[PDB]
Structures are given as structure tokens and as C-alpha cells.
Write a structure and sequence with these properties.
Bound molecules: the ligand CC(=O)N[C@@H](Cc1ccc(C(F)(F)P(=O)(O)O)cc1)C(=O)N[C@H]1CCCCN(Cc2ccc(-c3ccccc3)cc2)C1=O
CATH topology: SHC Adaptor Protein
CATH architecture: 2-Layer Sandwich
Strand order of the largest sheet: 1-2-3-4-5-6
PDB class: signaling protein
Structural class: alpha+beta
Strand content: 25-35%
Distance between the termini: 21 Å
Shape: globular
Protein name: Proto-oncogene tyrosine-protein kinase Src
Subcellular location: Cell membrane; Mitochondrion inner membrane; Nucleus; Cytoplasm, Cytoskeleton
Oligomer: monomer
CATH superfamily: SH2 domain
Family: Belongs to the protein kinase superfamily. Tyr protein kinase family. SRC subfamily.
Keywords: SH2 domain fragment approach, signaling protein
Length: 106
């Protein structure tokens, strides 16, 4: 159950996810997963980042879910569950701004 996951924030807005992530104490990779505001059945992985060019900022990655079962950001790399997707991206940065580190504070 994804709703049992502490990083699953469910139905919160894009602006709200940014308010939470734009916290000075958040190191790179702080994250949360929420429902998409516009695509039914899609989710969004919101991630905090930091660099000297942009400073603290947030990136949003759409996560697709196939009725055939897979969850993925890129169709080339799919997972059997949202939980497995989160675990993979906590170890590999791949095309993300940073690997996922810890759940966002509220
Ligand atoms: C308005 C906005 O923020 N759009 C996002 C895409 C986006 C659009 C819709 C939503 C949503 F539906 F959930 P919402 O409720 O907010 O409407 C979330 C994310 C975006 O453009 N992000 C960038 C985020 C930074 C990377 C560049 N890129 C393309 C890309 C390139 C590579 C990969 C990738 C990731 C991991 C592994 C391999 C490749 C993913 C996206 C993106 O999509």
C-alpha cells in the first residue's frame, strides 16, 4: 500500500509540494510522491536540489502507471511497484537531479 508509505503525500498540489521542499534545511534529494494534478492515474515525484547556479530548487518527475502493471519515469526502466521505483532511485541518480535521500518534513 502506497498510502502506507511515509513519503506518499497523496493529494497535495504542486505549489504545496514546492513550499514543503523549499526548506533551507533540506539537503539534495529530499522528496515526496503525490498524485498528479491533471493526469488521472499518474503520480509525481517532487525532488529538492541545490547548486551554485540555481541555489535551492525543486524538480518534478511524472511517474506513469500502466494498467499492465508497470510504474516508471522513463518507459525504458519500469518497476512492479511505486516502492521499488523509489528504492531504485535512492541508489541511482540516472536522469534525476540527485538520487533520492530522505522524506520531506511537513
Ligand atoms: C511543469 C514541470 O515541472 N514539468 C515537469 C514534468 C512534469 C509534468 C507534469 C507533472 C504532474 F502531472 F505530476 P503535475 O501535477 O505537477 O502537473 C509532473 C512533472 C518537467 O518538465 N520536469 C523536468 C525535470 C528535470 C529533467 C528534465 N525533464 C525531462 C526528463 C529527462 C530525463 C528524465 C529521466 C529521469 C530518470 C531516469 C531517466 C530519465 C526525466 C525527465 C523534465 O521532465
Amino acid at each position: 500500500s502506497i498510502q502506507a508509505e511515509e513519503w506518499y503525500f497523496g493529494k497535495i498540489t504542486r505549489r504545496e509540494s514546492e513550499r514543503l521542499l523549499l526548506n533551507a534545511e533540506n539537503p539534495r534529494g529530499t522528496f515526496l510522491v503525490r498524485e498528479s494534478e491533471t493526469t488521472k492515474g499518474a503520480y509525481c515525484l517532487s525532488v529538492s536540489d541545490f547548486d551554485n547556479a540555481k541555489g535551492l530548487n525543486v524538480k518534478h518527475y511524472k511517474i506513469r502507471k500502466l494498467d499492465s502493471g508497470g510504474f516508471y519515469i522513463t518507459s525504458r526502466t519500469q518497476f512492479n511497484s511505486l516502492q521499488q521505483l523509489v528504492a531504485y532511485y535512492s541508489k541511482h541518480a540516472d536522469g534525476l537531479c540527485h538520487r533520492l535521500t530522505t522524506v520531506c518534513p511537513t
